[PDB]
Amino acid sequence: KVFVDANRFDIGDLVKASKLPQRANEKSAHHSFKQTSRSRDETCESNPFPRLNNPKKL
Amino acid sequence: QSFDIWKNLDRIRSTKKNAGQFIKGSLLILPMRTEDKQQFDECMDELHKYISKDILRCYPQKEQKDEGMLFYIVLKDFNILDSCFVLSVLLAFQKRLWMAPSEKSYFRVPKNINLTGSFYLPKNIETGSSIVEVGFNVVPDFQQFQVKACHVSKFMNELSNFFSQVEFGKCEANVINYFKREYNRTYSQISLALYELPLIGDGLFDIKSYISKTRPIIETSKAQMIKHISEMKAYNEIS
Amino acid sequence: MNYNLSKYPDDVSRLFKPRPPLSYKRPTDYPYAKRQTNPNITGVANLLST
Amino acid sequence: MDKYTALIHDENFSTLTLNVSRYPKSLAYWEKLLNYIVKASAPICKSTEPQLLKLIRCTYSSMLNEFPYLENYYIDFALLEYKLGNVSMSHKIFQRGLQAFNQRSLLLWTSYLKFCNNVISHQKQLFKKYETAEEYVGLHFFSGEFWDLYLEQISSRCTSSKKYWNVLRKILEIPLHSFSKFYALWLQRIDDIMDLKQLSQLTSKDELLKKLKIDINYSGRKGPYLQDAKKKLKKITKEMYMVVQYQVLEIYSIFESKIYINYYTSPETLVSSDEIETWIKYLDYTITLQTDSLTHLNFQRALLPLAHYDLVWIKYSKWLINSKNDLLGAKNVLLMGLKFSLKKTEIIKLLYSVICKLNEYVLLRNLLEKIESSYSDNVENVDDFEIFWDYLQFKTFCQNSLYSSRYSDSQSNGLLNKELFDKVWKRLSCKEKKSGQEILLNNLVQFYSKDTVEFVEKNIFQKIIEFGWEYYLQNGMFWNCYCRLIYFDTSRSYLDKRQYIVRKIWPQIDKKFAQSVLPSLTEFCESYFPEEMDTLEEMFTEEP
Numbered sequence: 052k053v054f055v056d057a058n059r060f061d062i063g064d065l066v067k068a069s070k071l072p073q074r075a076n077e078k079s080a081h082h083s084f085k086q087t088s089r090s091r092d093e094t095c096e097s098n099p100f101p102r103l104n105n106p107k108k109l
Numbered sequence: 110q111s112f113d114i115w116k117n118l119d120r121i122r123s124t125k126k127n128a129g130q131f132i133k134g135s136l137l138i139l140p141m142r143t144e145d146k147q148q149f150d151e152c153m154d155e156l157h158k159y160i161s162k163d164i165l166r167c168y169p170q171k172e173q174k175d176e177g178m179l180f181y182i183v184l185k186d187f188n189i190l191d192s193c194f195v196l197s198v199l200l201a202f203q204k205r206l207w208m209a210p211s212e213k214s215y216f217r218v219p220k221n222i223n224l225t226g227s228f229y230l231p232k233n234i235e236t237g238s239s240i241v242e243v244g245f246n247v248v249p250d251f252q253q254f255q256v257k258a259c260h261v262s263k264f265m266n267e268l269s270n271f272f273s274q275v276e277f278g279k280c281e282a283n284v285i286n287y288f289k290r291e292y293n294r295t296y297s298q299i300s301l302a303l304y305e306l307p308l309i310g311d312g313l314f315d316i317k318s319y320i321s322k323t324r325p326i327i328e329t330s331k332a333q334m335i336k337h338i339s340e341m342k343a344y345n346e347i348s
Numbered sequence: 349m350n351y352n353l354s355k356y357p358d359d360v361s362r363l364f365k366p367r368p369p370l371s372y373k374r375p376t377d378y379p380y381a382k383r384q385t386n387p388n389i390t391g392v393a394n395l396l397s398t
Numbered sequence: 399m400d401k402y403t404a405l406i407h408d409e410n411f412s413t414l415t416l417n418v419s420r421y422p423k424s425l426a427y428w429e430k431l432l433n434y435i436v437k438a439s440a441p442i443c444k445s446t447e448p449q450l451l452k453l454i455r456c457t458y459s460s461m462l463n464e465f466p467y468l469e470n471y472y473i474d475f476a477l478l479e480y481k482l483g484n485v486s487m488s489h490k491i492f493q494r495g496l497q498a499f500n501q502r503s504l505l506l507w508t509s510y511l512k513f514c515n516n517v518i519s520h521q522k523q524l525f526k527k528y529e530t531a532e533e534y535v536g537l538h539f540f541s542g543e544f545w546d547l548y549l550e551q552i553s554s555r556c557t558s559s560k561k562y563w564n565v566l567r568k569i570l571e572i573p574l575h576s577f578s579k580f581y582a583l584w585l586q587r588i589d590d591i592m593d594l595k596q597l598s599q600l601t602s603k604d605e606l607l608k609k610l611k612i613d614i615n616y617s618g619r620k621g622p623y624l625q626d627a628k629k630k631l632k633k634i635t636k637e638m639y640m641v642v643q644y645q646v647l648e649i650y651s652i653f654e655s656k657i658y659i660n661y662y663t664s665p666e667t668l669v670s671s672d673e674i675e676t677w678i679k680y681l682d683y684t685i686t687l688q689t690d691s692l693t694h695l696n697f698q699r700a701l702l703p704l705a706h707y708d709l710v711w712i713k714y715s716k717w718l719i720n721s722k723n724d725l726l727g728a729k730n731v732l733l734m735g736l737k738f739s740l741k742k743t744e745i746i747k748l749l750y751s752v753i754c755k756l757n758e759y760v761l762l763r764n765l766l767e768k769i770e771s772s773y774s775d776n777v778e779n780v781d782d783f784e785i786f787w788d789y790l791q792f793k794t795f796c797q798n799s800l801y802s803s804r805y806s807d808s809q810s811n812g813l814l815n816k817e818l819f820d821k822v823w824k825r826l827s828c829k830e831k832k833s834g835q836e837i838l839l840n841n842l843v844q845f846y847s848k849d850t851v852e853f854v855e856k857n858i859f860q861k862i863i864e865f866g867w868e869y870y871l872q873n874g875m876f877w878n879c880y881c882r883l884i885y886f887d888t889s890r891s892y893l894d895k896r897q898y899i900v901r902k903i904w905p906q907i908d909k910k911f912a913q914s915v916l917p918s919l920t921e922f923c924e925s926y927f928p929e930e931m932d933t934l935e936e937m938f939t940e941e942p
Contacts (some may be wrong), residue, residue, distance in 0.1 A: 142760045142764065143760065144760065144763070174764070176764075176767065177763075177764045177767075207759055207799060223757075225757040226758075241724065243727045243730070244694065244718065244724050244727040245500070245694070245718065245727045245730050245731050246727075246730060247730045247733065247734060255724075255725070255726045257725075298737060299737060300768055302737040303736065303768045303772050306769070306772055306785075307772065313420075314423055314424060314666070315421040315427075319424075319666050322666075323668065
């Protein structure tokens with residue numbers, strides 16, 4: 052709700068609004084990775100133990 | 110010197126180099142508790158006679174506990190002496206009940222006792238020992254001060270040496286309603302934290318799903334410690 | 349001023365930072381409700397006699 | 399029907415709200431309730447239904463009054479109220495967020511300053527807020543973002559460029575996680591200097607003239623002398639780089655590499671065995687350095703991951719007692735540690751002692767009433783003995799100090815005041831259901847006088863015999879205590895106390911119980927009566 056930068060309440064609508072049309076098929080057909088859109092509706096229950104899901108050291 | 114407030118007070122009147130003219134916008138709030146009200150009212154009535162009513166007010170709380178009354182003592186616009194007089198009288202009187210139950214004279218302070226308590230000043234002070242500040246104060250606006258266990262004469266002496274240095278500025282008119290509301294919020298929070306002392310397991314924690322969420326990890330933890338002890342036993346063993 | 353609606357790459361919109369916001373200093377003239385030229389313009393038939 | 403009435407007649411709302419109102423301290427129910435109310439207004443703007451905005455505000459305010467260490471929800475509630483039109487409320491939301499963290503949180507200062515840059519529009523006031531944030535959360539190990547934000551505002555507003563050099567020289571001595579960027583600023587900004595009058599931006603001209611043997615007002619050929627100047631200042635910066643690199647790399651290699659979790663999470667979460675150990679070592683490190691803002695900050699930083707554990711609440715309070723000697727500070731730390739920690743017993747036991755040493759006894763007398771009223775005047779029947787015994791010791795201290803001594807030779811009546819002895823006897827009457835009976839017995843036999851011991855022997859021990867209760871008759875500690883009461887009485891001579899024990903206690907114990915009573919009574923008779931050991935062995939020989 053804070054760090055995603057697309058679900059922020061102040062600049063929330065602007066990021067979705069200025070995404071751009073992408074009227075090019077091959078623009079989306081270039082990249083074949085995942086999008087990883089983290090929703091705003093997520094809760095505390097998922098990932099109950101943070102160490103066991105494999106963490107990275109700083 | 111002596112243990113009579115008036116001799117110490119006339120000493121601190123004579124020797125303190127403009128001990129009279131007061132401190133601009135100076136307000137001090139000292140919240141004090143008593144078990145019985147009728148012993149308190151005699152001390153506060155004699156105290157009220159000597160000090161101007163505008164300078165010193167006593168705000169009772171709503172009597173929510175109904176057993177221990179919590180009276181705020183507020184000194185607005187006090188001199189360098191009035192503070193010494195009121196603090197010596199009240200700091201002795203709230204400790205008179207425990208140590209000297211027989212003497213019973215509200216302006217003479219017996220020699221077995223030492224003055225110990227705490228008062229609040231606003232944060233917008235500029236200070237440019239026996240009275241120290243606190244770290245980690247709990248009321249969001251005010252600066253808790255501690256006075257640690259002195260004679261009556263050293264208390265007067267150190268209160269005058271302290272209030273010479275300090276320099277107040279520009280609070281609101283009803284900041285005292287803000288302190289009343291805030292201190293009552295804080296002790297309502299700690300009372301309602303003591304009311305959760307029985308109710309931890311299943312009272313409000315949905316233990317039925319928490320146990321099922323952290324049962325396997327306690328089990329793997331116990332496995333890892335048993336493996337640790339067998340590994341450490343094989344490490345220490347001469348064999 | 350963290351995330352931009354501008355088409356230009358974040359590189360180009362580092363260049364177009366504005367100045368800091370304008371300080372508030374109180375107005376010195378008449379507000380928009382009270383702005384009027386003078387009413388009570390008196391008559392003209394006084395002039396024609398004397 | 400509108401959004402509010404439609405939301406109320408929905409079926410999920412009663413279920414989510416009843417699960418929140420049944421289980422308050424579980425966080426996932428609160429977040430499910432909150433996401434449902436926010437999704438139930440799919441455009442949020444200034445015209446949405448005011449009966450529903452009042453409910454979103456009550457939900458967020460009540461959650462943050464329950465879970466006050468949730469950093470991200472203060473930011474989110476303040477940004478919601480900033481969307482809804484009023485910045486005046488969002489200032490208050492951030493400021494109670496900082497105050498519940500006692501001003502030492504990095505994330506709320508960073509988000510509050512990136513908020514406040516837009517809306518405060520008065521330069522000296524915004525810089526007073528940055529100086530406030532500096533003096534609280536400046537020396538944080540990850541505060542590179544705060545200082546870089548501060549230098550951004552200084553380089554965009556100010557026209558003097560002296561304040562930049564000042565602030566950057568203060569960055570150069572702080573051991574930050576990413577100090578090499580704040581050194582590279584200083585290096586390229588020395589290298590971007592042009593003439594000799596600008597070397598007084600760094601330090602004073604006499605410091606240069608003494609320490610580095612360099613004159614600003616050297617007029618002549620100023621090419622080689624300026625290059626000599628830049629090389630000597632770069633050498634001094636290299637030495638200060640070595641000192642900050644050593645301290646940063648030491649903190650990182652030993653302590654800060656091991657902490658993985660820096661966030662509040664929820665009251666149902668467990669912190670690893672690794673990180674309890676490295677937070678205790680890292681606080682013990684920090685206390686040695688004798689920087690006080692960094693020590694309060696590291697304690698308030700360690701109270702995010704394990705606020706509830708209470709290891710820190712006690713360690714922080716004992717630091718305020720015996721290293722800095724600020725004892726009301728250590729009373730307030732435990733008063734705030736009651737609200738968060740779930741294992742309150744060790745804090746209440748230390749708290750009683752701190753309150754007694756401050757000579758604030760009415761606060762103790764009032765604090766005991768909240769425990770003896772939190773169980774509804776029935777602390778005598780509490781499950782955990784650890785609460786009751788810590789209660790009863792300080793209640794006995796107060797009850798001796800109120801009512802003067804009732805017995806002779808100046809003896810305060812201890813447990814045997816008629817108000818406390820009832821609390822003792824209602825717990826000795828439960829007989830095996832409540833734990834810790836032996837310590838009540840063993841703490842009731844220290845009187846060592848005539849009429850005091852006569853009271854104890856007439857009221858507890860004789861009455862346990864008279865009721866004939868099987869738990870205490872069975873148990874050897876009871877008869878060991880009932881001998882040790884009489885034998886340490888200083889009112890009897892040797893002959894009458896020995897004859898009283900052997901003639902009128904030892905006959906009363908039942909021979910069917912002898913297999914449990916004899917191992918505890920044998921140690922007594924072997925320690926104090928080696929002569930009368932054969933009598934005790936022949937009272938319980940295997941053949942009658």
